[PDB]
Amino acid sequence: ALSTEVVHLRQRTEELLRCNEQQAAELETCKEQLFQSNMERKELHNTVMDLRGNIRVFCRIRPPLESEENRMCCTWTYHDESTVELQSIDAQAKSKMGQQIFSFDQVFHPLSSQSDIFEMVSPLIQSALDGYNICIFAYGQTGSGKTYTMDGVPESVGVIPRTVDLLFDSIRGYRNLGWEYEIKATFLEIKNEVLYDLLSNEQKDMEIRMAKNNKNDIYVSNITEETVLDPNHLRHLMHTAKMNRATASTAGNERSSRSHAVTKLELIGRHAEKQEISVGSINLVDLAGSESPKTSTRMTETKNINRSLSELTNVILALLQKQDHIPYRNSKLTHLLMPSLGGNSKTLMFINVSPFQDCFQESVKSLRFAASVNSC
Amino acid sequence: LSTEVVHLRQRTEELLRCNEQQAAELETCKEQLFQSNMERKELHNTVMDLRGNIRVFCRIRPPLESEENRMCCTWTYHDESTVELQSIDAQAKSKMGQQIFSFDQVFHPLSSQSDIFEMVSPLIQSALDGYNICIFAYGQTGSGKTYTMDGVPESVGVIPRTVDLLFDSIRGYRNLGWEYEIKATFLEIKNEVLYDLLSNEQKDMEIRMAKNNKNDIYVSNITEETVLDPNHLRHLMHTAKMNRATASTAGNERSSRSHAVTKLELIGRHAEKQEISVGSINLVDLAGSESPINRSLSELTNVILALLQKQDHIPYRNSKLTHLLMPSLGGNSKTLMFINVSPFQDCFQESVKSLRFAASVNSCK
Amino acid sequence: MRECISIHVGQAGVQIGNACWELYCLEHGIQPDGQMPDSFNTFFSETGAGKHVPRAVFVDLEPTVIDEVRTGTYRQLFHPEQLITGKEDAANNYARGHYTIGKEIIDLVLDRIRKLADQCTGLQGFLVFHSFGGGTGSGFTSLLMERLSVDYGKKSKLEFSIYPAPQVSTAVVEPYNSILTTHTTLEHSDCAFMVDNEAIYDICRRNLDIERPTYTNLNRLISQIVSSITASLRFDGALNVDLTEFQTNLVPYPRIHFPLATYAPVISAEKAYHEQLSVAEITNACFEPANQMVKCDPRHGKYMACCLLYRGDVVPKDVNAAIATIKTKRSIQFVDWCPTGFKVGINYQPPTVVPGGDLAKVQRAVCMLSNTTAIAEAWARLDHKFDLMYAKRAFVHWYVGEGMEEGEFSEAREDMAALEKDYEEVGV
Amino acid sequence: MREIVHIQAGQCGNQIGAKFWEVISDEHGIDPTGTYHGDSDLQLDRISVYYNEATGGKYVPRAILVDLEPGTMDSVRSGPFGQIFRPDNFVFGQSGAGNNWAKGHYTEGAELVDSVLDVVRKEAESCDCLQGFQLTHSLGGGTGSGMGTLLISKIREEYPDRIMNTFSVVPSPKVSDTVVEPYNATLSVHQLVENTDETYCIDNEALYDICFRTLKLTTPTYGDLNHLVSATMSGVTTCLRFPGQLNADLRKLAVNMVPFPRLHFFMPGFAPLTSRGSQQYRALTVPELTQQVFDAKNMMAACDPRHGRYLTVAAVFRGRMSMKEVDEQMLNVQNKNSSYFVEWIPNNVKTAVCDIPPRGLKMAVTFIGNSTAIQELFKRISEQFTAMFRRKAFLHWYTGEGMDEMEFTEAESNMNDLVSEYQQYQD
Ligand SMILES: Nc1nc2c(ncn2[C@@H]2O[C@H](COP(=O)(O)OP(=O)(O)OP(=O)(O)O)[C@@H](O)[C@H]2O)c(=O)[nH]1
Ligand SMILES: Nc1nc2c(ncn2[C@@H]2O[C@H](COP(=O)(O)OP(=O)(O)O)[C@@H](O)[C@H]2O)c(=O)[nH]1
Ligand SMILES: Nc1ncnc2c1ncn2[C@@H]1O[C@H](COP(=O)(O)OP(=O)(O)O)[C@@H](O)[C@H]1O
Ligand SMILES: [Mg+2]
Numbered sequence A: 001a002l003s004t005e006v007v008h009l010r011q012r013t014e015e016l017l018r019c020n021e022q023q024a025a026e027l028e029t030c031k032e033q034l035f036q037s038n039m040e041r042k043e044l045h046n047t048v049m050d051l052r053g054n055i056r057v058f059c060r061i062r063p064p065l066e067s068e069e070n071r072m073c074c075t076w077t078y079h080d081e082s083t084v085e086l087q088s089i090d091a092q093a094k095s096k097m098g099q100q101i102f103s104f105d106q107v108f109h110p111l112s113s114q115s116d117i118f119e120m121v122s123p124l125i126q127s128a129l130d131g132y133n134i135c136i137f138a139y140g141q142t143g144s145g146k147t148y149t150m151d152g153v154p155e156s157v158g159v160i161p162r163t164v165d166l167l168f169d170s171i172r173g174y175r176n177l178g179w180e181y182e183i184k185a186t187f188l189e190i191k192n193e194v195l196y197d198l199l200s201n202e203q204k205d206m207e208i209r210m211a212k213n214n215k216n217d218i219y220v221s222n223i224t225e226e227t228v229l230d231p232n233h234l235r236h237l238m239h240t241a242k243m244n245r246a247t248a249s250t251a252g253n254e255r256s257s258r259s260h261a262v263t264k265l266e267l268i269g270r271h272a273e274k275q276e277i278s279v280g281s282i283n284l285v286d287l288a289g290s291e292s293p294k295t296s297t298r299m300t301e302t303k304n305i306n307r308s309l310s311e312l313t314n315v316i317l318a319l320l321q322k323q324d325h326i327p328y329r330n331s332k333l334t335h336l337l338m339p340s341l342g343g344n345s346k347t348l349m350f351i352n353v354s355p356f357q358d359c360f361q362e363s364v365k366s367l368r369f370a371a372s373v374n375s376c
Numbered sequence B: 001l002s003t004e005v006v007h008l009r010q011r012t013e014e015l016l017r018c019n020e021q022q023a024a025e026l027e028t029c030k031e032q033l034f035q036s037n038m039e040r041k042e043l044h045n046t047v048m049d050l051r052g053n054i055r056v057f058c059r060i061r062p063p064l065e066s067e068e069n070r071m072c073c074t075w076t077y078h079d080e081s082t083v084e085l086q087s088i089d090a091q092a093k094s095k096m097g098q099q100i101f102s103f104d105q106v107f108h109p110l111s112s113q114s115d116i117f118e119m120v121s122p123l124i125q126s127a128l129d130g131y132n133i134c135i136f137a138y139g140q141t142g143s144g145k146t147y148t149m150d151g152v153p154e155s156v157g158v159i160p161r162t163v164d165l166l167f168d169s170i171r172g173y174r175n176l177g178w179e180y181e182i183k184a185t186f187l188e189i190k191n192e193v194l195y196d197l198l199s200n201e202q203k204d205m206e207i208r209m210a211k212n213n214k215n216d217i218y219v220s221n222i223t224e225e226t227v228l229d230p231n232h233l234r235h236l237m238h239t240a241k242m243n244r245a246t247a248s249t250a251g252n253e254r255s256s257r258s259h260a261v262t263k264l265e266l267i268g269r270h271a272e273k274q275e276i277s278v279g280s281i282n283l284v285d286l287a288g289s290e291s292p293i294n295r296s297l298s299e300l301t302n303v304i305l306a307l308l309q310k311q312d313h314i315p316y317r318n319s320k321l322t323h324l325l326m327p328s329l330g331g332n333s334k335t336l337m338f339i340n341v342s343p344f345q346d347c348f349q350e351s352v353k354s355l356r357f358a359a360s361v362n363s364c365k
Numbered sequence C: 001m002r003e004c005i006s007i008h009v010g011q012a013g014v015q016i017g018n019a020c021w022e023l024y025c026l027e028h029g030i031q032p033d034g035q036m037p038d039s040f041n042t043f044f045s046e047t048g049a050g051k052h053v054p055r056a057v058f059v060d061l062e063p064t065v066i067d068e069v070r071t072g073t074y075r076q077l078f079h080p081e082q083l084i085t086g087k088e089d090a091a092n093n094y095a096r097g098h099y100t101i102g103k104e105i106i107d108l109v110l111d112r113i114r115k116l117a118d119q120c121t122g123l124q125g126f127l128v129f130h131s132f133g134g135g136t137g138s139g140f141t142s143l144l145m146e147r148l149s150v151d152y153g154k155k156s157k158l159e160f161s162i163y164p165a166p167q168v169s170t171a172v173v174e175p176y177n178s179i180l181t182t183h184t185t186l187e188h189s190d191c192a193f194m195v196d197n198e199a200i201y202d203i204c205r206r207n208l209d210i211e212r213p214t215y216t217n218l219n220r221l222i223s224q225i226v227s228s229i230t231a232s233l234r235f236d237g238a239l240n241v242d243l244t245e246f247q248t249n250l251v252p253y254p255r256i257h258f259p260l261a262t263y264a265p266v267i268s269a270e271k272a273y274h275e276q277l278s279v280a281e282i283t284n285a286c287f288e289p290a291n292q293m294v295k296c297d298p299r300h301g302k303y304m305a306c307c308l309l310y311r312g313d314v315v316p317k318d319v320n321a322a323i324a325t326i327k328t329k330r331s332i333q334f335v336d337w338c339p340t341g342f343k344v345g346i347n348y349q350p351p352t353v354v355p356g357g358d359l360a361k362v363q364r365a366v367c368m369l370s371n372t373t374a375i376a377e378a379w380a381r382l383d384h385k386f387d388l389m390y391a392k393r394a395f396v397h398w399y400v401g402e403g404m405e406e407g408e409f410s411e412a413r414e415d416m417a418a419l420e421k422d423y424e425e426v427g428v
Numbered sequence D: 001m002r003e004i005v006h007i008q009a010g011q012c013g014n015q016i017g018a019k020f021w022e023v024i025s026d027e028h029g030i031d032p033t034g035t036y037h038g039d040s041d042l043q044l045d046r047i048s049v050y051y052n053e054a055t056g057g058k059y060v061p062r063a064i065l066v067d068l069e070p071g072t073m074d075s076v077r078s079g080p081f082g083q084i085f086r087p088d089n090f091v092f093g094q095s096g097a098g099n100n101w102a103k104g105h106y107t108e109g110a111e112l113v114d115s116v117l118d119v120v121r122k123e124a125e126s127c128d129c130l131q132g133f134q135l136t137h138s139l140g141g142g143t144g145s146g147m148g149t150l151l152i153s154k155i156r157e158e159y160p161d162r163i164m165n166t167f168s169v170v171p172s173p174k175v176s177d178t179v180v181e182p183y184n185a186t187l188s189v190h191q192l193v194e195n196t197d198e199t200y201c202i203d204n205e206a207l208y209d210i211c212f213r214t215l216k217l218t219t220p221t222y223g224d225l226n227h228l229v230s231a232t233m234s235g236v237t238t239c240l241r242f243p244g245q246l247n248a249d250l251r252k253l254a255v256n257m258v259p260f261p262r263l264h265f266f267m268p269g270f271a272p273l274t275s276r277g278s279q280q281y282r283a284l285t286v287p288e289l290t291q292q293v294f295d296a297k298n299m300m301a302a303c304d305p306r307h308g309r310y311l312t313v314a315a316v317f318r319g320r321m322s323m324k325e326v327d328e329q330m331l332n333v334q335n336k337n338s339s340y341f342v343e344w345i346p347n348n349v350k351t352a353v354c355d356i357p358p359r360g361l362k363m364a365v366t367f368i369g370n371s372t373a374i375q376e377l378f379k380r381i382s383e384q385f386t387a388m389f390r391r392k393a394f395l396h397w398y399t400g401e402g403m404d405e406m407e408f409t410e411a412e413s414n415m416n417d418l419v420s421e422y423q424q425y426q427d
Helices: A003-052 A066-070 A091-097 A115-129 A146-150 A159-177 A231-244 A299-320 A332-336 A357-375 B002-051 B113-128 B145-149 B158-176 B230-243 B295-308 B320-324 B348-364 C010-027 C064-071 C094-100 C106-119 C135-151 C174-188 C197-206 C215-234 C243-250 C279-285 C316-328 C373-391 C396-400 C406-427 D010-028 D041-045 D071-078 D101-106 D108-125 D143-158 D181-195 D204-214 D222-241 D250-257 D286-293 D323-336 D374-387 D395-399 D405-425
Strands: A055-061 A075-077 A083-087 A100-103 A133-140 A180-191 A194-197 A208-210 A218-220 A260-271 A276-286 A346-353 B056-060 B074-078 B082-086 B100-102 B105-107 B133-139 B179-189 B194-196 B207-209 B217-219 B225-227 B259-269 B280-288 B334-341 C002-009 C044-046 C052-054 C056-060 C122-129 C156-159 C260-263 C303-312 C364-372 D003-008 D051-054 D058-061 D063-067 D090-092 D130-136 D163-167 D198-200 D265-270 D310-319 D349-351 D363-371
Touching (some): A003 B002, A055 A299, A083 A357, A180 A332, A260 A332, A299 A332, A346 A357, A357 C406, B133 B348, B158 B259, B295 B348, C010 C052, C010 C056, C010 C064, C010 C215, C056 C064, C094 C135, C135 C174, C174 C406, C243 C364, C364 C373, D071 D090, D130 D250, D181 D374, D198 D250, D222 D265, D250 D349, D250 D363, D310 D323, D323 D349
Parallel strands (some): A055 A346, A133 A276, B056 B105
Antiparallel strands (some): A083 A100, C303 C364
């Protein structure tokens, strides 16, 4: 069983080599087909978004507290999942303001929790993987739930942890496609119309500057750019940035609830075999308090905040009306977000509303321009 | 010599190990491919839903060489989705008001078959997703409905292009583990009597709800040829148009007043997984819309208008053609409807008769 | 003495008040110094010495015009601490005058008026003169008005604001100021007498036959108006009417409180000889739309109420006859639900002509305080201009950059739309 | 009392400021010494806004003189009204910009900016309520551009509340006086649109046309052009320095003129411009003043207004007049030239009747129009700039000074954005 063993082993080697050749050919074919399917679904999903959106306005109302529910609350009429009606209880308010009905992409019930958020993030992260620059806006007044929805709580995390985990599992799955994704974490604060750094305590000078490659691409000089290596690394970075942004939010309402924190995650996917590179970035940006400036103590920067908010409103409505030029350069926040606002870039617009009477004017203000955005 | 034996043993071991790991990677990639393809189909049908439901299109056709001495009308084109027609009779121009109609898309006599097939082609992919698709060509006699559907060998109609795209997509998707079978039935409805277009064996033919889906319709006694390649289906269409008994030479009332129903059922199965699809393509060539039988045409119009009205009850079983397309006019399905208009003064009233149907369609949606 | 005090904000307010107070001190023979070489106690807190200080509070955010009056012939007339001045003007900003300079001087001006009120025994009401396009006259005026309504509420607050002209807007940003100040003043204003520069321009053109009219002449006219208003207090008449009866007689509803003024015998001296100036004829004249002090057509709107103030040599029989005739008129429309509104203010103190003035010496004069539907279109076009500005968000950066939100702009806009809605629904 | 701080950068700016200060002193009856000798106390009443008080009844202009070569300042000091300045104010380098913006904004500016900002602060704190700064310079040269932009960027970042006035002398379209003025202008406007909030664009070609044609002048010396510009500049603030029927100020018209933060470039205009001997033939009334001040023949900028639309117009008047005329004539011109006015800003005219006319004159009008015709000028400059950019003409002189070409790309893109704004609001 030795001489015939040589022939048997030669035949076995021939068969195994044939199987190797077939599996390699079909593996190259299936890699190519997987890439083709991925780009086909990229284009299909982007067409879906453009037909249904490309400027998405989402409205959410937080549930009142057990003591604040006994506090007077307005009647909330949900005509459907897309329209919500707010009616002030006051008779004179009813007579003068009349009916306040508003149209949005989707209306959140106070008991909707964070699930609808996740199922809107899923197409959002999907489009982020398409190589598209997507920006997120957490607009609203203080205490309306903006910090509850963005950062969240240990029992129910906000949008950011869910997005981080979804992105990490997505990139680890796409590693099976030979795609190597480099993700960059950038943190900055916009106060007094001058940029600051969240990762570095030392006081440096920022200036907005278009990137070397393209005029439309923008970066900021002298920022602390961190290469994300593991999810927990990113979580620790976000914790340090949240710790660095320590100031009065509700006790004094000094700078927090009056600042513009921009969280930009620049993702650069590379695939060496086909020498194609995908570039994208997500912008988790929370807005400042939209309240009317009444503190005579530091009213100037509140007026600047109002300027910033009004300029953002002007920019978005210019986006809607197909205006030839859109005033990106009127404000720092718009100017540094111009790549994420124009062209194929897609914006989610998130608004939080307070269910009490003192925010009736502010709730109406928050709702009216967003509904106007929905109209056009 | 035993050194060669040991070397071959270690080579066999390494080759089997590499083959096993490569096969595992291969199968994982195949699973990823399937999970991507299902989402692709879902996105495609989402696009179809977002684009609309009725998909109103008008296709004005140029006059022929024998129609150069006829009197045309004033076609007022607006943008690309609105069209207006006026009679050159100045006495009746002030008596007509506003004869303007806005549809989803407008086709002018300079549009080729490719322009219509651009709109039609995604519906073939949608039908590949297990959904029923309908294509309608509506108009008076001489409008151009047969040219839209059948066409000429020079400029092929919608059906040959749909078949070619269907086979291209089937052979593209063969790598995705799915196998498809094409079932073709050719049928004609003349006076509420069903006529088989692939057999001369006249029998009794009836419509019954499907044994496995009470919302689905299967027709008894119909021959169901399994299409192997585009040549086979072309031969089937050739035999059907031979069997249609085109009496245009003597007694044109037979051909130009009969609805021609072409049904193409797509079924998709997947071994090693679960997949059930019964998506079918109903390529119906409607009869003349001239006023006087018209039971089927009026019933189709009423059913479409009620469906766009979200009516509680749809009169599906009041005509042969409506009950035939009862599973093909569901809410989840996508419907296409073309209006062919003759650009002639004598056809001006028949033109507005064909156009006010869509004018009610878009005003009701 | 049911005394009243007056407030003057903005360049217009101060100029108008200058003309007014010169007219007043002319009425009672008061020298510019402040001594008469009883009646006047309503407006002059005369001290032990012959120094009849007027009860006037002049406020401005820029020192120019106030300094001028501190240099004019009336510097020693006014109490030097009355004249309050800022350092920078509101520059057409409601924002500045309501948030950034207004609260920086409002404590002082409120204190001074509190002192003045404590000085008065029987507080009658408040008079404020301002504009609408004026940044101060809008922002600061609204702030002060809501502040007073907080402080007193019960007293009478009368605005003699100047409505922006329909054809000429001296300030490009007038609609913004007007809408904002109206929204913030509606609920704190008892009754706001409106007047316009274009209309009074036409008046001095075709009636005074003055070819080059200056702001001085318009101010003379407004001074005559206010003198007629206050004659019933400063003087005794057959029927005296105080400011309190105005709210009752004129406004039917809390929001509809925008009468428009009119003054009939406005002829020049040369034409004075060709007319007898009868009661009936001047009564008819005051109803002529060409004689209104606001560029609106009373002919196109029904009247809500009419208050008529007669001064000089007048007889009640004639007044009743003329009113009856006007009741018989056809072009003079009236709403049904108030079929009798003609509260009369006959008085027998003839108006006095300022030396160097343009008016003629007339035996009898009438001032008409009409309230009518014919102002709805003025609001309509103002709102239209505001919508034009706001559609392009023009100039909004100045306002949101100094205290407010564009949401607040929308609030004021919809509030005005509701006002017009209520106004027309009352009209039917 | 809303005092104003005057800065003069570049030799052009210095000469213009010399003319401006002499005409102002003429207005207030100030001798070269500084001893007042006028008669109207109104001169004293607001004398503070431009003059600091000095011991012994003298007055000194609240002015700062900046340059990088001494010669111009030596001429000024030697010239009449030279001693009027407080000598400490003359701040100057020794090198000279050499018509290079890069030097005057990165090296000589770097070394002199503190030595001037100190005296800037010293003057600022010597004021009761600071109103704003007026900067006089030119966009063509080196120091008046680089230094000017540097000073603007400095002043803005620690005086954000105040207002900035820049009477930039915009480069001429045809008679170019500098082979590289495209680079200077493009780099300057990049800073200008960010920090200042009202800019008076002036062109020498337009002023040549004015003096030669309307004034029938044959020897258009720079003295005359500077005299014209100075008259306009004094007319801008006479409402601030003097009483009137509608007292305006820089704050007043600042908000009126600019609908949007970036669109703050204006075309001045001065009405009564009778020639040497034609004053006899012409009556001087409001109609003439208005019709003259609304002629493309009379704009100090070289843009034809008829090519665009007036976004906003301000009309400041001096002298004794009845505002009825001015109201009706503004209405009239608004009606006739409705094509020339933007539709969505009704009644886009601002009026500021003052009282005191310029000496030797009875009525005077200053025009400030924020028309869209400026976009043609900016297009011309952008075309000239990009014409000599990709050939890198003269680029080395800048690049070796410590700047990168992407800075040129930045400035060019920004100015193109300005052009986009103007052409967009044209409709
Ligand atoms: N009838 C009359 N109206 C005047 C007179 N003077 C000014 N006005 C009007 O009053 C307004 C004057 O503006 P102000 O109220 O003083 O505003 P301001 O105090 O300067 O603050 P800003 O508006 O921001 O400049 C203008 O709109 C004129 O139309 C006057 O003498 N008589
Ligand atoms: N109106 C006026 N313009 C001048 C005068 N002198 C120079 N200019 C202009 O200023 C520009 C020269 O730039 P400039 O600032 O003087 O050079 P720099 O001082 O070295 O930066 C040229 O375009 C001249 O047209 C002057 O006396 N009057
Ligand atoms: N776009 C076109 N170009 C040329 N010929 C056309 C066109 N459309 C229709 N025809 C002519 O119309 C005939 C088809 O008849 P058709 O009008 O479709 O019958 P029906 O009245 O049933 O619609 C063909 O013979 C063809 O010559
Ligand atoms: Mg046919």
